Amino acid sequence: EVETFAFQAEIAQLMSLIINTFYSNKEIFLRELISNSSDALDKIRYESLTDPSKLDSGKELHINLIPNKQDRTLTIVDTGIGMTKADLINNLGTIAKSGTKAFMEALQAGADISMIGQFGVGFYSAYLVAEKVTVITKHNDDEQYAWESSAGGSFTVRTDTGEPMGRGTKVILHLKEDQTEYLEERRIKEIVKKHSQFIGYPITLFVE
Numbered sequence: 001e002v003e004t005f006a007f008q009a010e011i012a013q014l015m016s017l018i019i020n021t022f023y024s025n026k027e028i029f030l031r032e033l034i035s036n037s038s039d040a041l042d043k044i045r046y047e048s049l050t051d052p053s054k055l056d057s058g059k060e061l062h063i064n065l066i067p068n069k070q071d072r073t074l075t076i077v078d079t080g081i082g083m084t085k086a087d088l089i090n091n092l093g094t095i096a097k098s099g100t101k102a103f104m105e106a107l108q109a110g111a112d113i114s115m116i117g118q119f120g121v122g123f124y125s126a127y128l129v130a131e132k133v134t135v136i137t138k139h140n141d142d143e144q145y146a147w148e149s150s151a152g153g154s155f156t157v158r159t160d161t162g163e164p165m166g167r168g169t170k171v172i173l174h175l176k177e178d179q180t181e182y183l184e185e186r187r188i189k190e191i192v193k194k195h196s197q198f199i200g201y202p203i204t205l206f207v208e
């Protein structure tokens, strides 16, 4: 069954802002998502040092970028720590509240949208380019969940029946009609080179 949740007022407001503000430098969405993957891979890396069994659901620590022109999606896949249902429904929104407020104040003093990640809310930059985001995630202590939102003030969570993923997180960007340039091999490569050149895990760009 599909559960529908409201965003806390502040996130909904960050989300509208990201959708509504005129801002051409949309490409920074990719570095934000990659950096979130990097923090997650680090974390499962740290946790297995004192418990190697936390790696039984997969030993490879990596990042895959998969475009699919047929569906119109850019999926960012990591094998990092993954998210529990608690994360999805309460915890992530709890921690995001403060980062949101800070961010939203800075945008005045002179800051701009490319700085969202210095506040820990770079995930919602997904909405510069995607009309819908689907997030498939699997943590060691929980089952596999699908989170989803087209913004609008609500998101859903359901247990995922798709392909089992071991451990990690897939962010599936359903691109806006005018943003298919992020399906293109040479565009993604350019972006990864300029902003994500020095990540500590292999990034494999899949071709179509």
Ligand SMILES: CCCCn1c(Cc2cc(OC)ccc2OC)nc2c(N)nc(F)nc21
Pocket (backbone or CB within 6 Å): 036, 037, 040, 078, 080, 081, 082, 083, 088, 092, 093, 096, 120, 121, 122, 123, 124, 135, 147, 169
């Ligand atoms: C805010 C940092 C933690 C949340 N997070 C994020 C940021 C994030 C994801 C969300 O998914 C529905 C929602 C909100 C988020 O940040 C506020 N990306 C992650 C990732 N790839 N892997 C893991 F494991 N955790 C992630």
